[PDB]
């Protein structure tokens, strides 16, 4: 929660208003952006399990 990417800000606000108080691990959204990198995905041996 505590920074900048307002993308899950909407989800956080909706969950809190619902009192859901829930979050999704997802990816460093910025490391998902670093995959966007990945030498342009050049390095994607990423064996997500």
């Amino acid at each position: 929660v505590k920074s900048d990417d307002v993308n899950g800000r909407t989800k956080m606000y909706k969950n809190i208003v619902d009192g859901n108080h829930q979050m999704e691990p997802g990816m460093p959204e910025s490391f998902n952006v670093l995959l966007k990198e990945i030498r342009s995905l050049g390095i994607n041996i990423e064996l997500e399990d």
Partner: protein
């Protein structure tokens, strides 16, 4: 410095899209609200009517009643009288 942006919460048409994303709605309701918001001209009114969105989608599931309901839920959120 990945991208750039302007006034927010006050986020322009995208502020309406977010206030739509800031309320509880299903996938179809959100999609129709987004069709209403993205189809809004520089004057603030709904640039493309429900019929244009239905024709572009070509989806029978999205109907005039459902589209009208989703737009009326998005008639006055941020600010009042958007997608006029």
């Amino acid at each position: 410095l990945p991208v750039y942006q302007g006034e927010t919460t006050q986020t322009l048409q995208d502020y309406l899209m977010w206030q739509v994303e800031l309320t509880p709605f299903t996938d179809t309701d959100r999609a129709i609200a987004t069709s209403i918001v993205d189809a809004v001209d520089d004057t603030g009114y709904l640039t493309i009517q429900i019929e244009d969105i239905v024709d572009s989608i070509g989806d029978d599931e999205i109907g005039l009643e459902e589209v009208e309901a989703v737009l009326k839920r998005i008639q006055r959120f941020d600010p009042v009288g958007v997608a006029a």
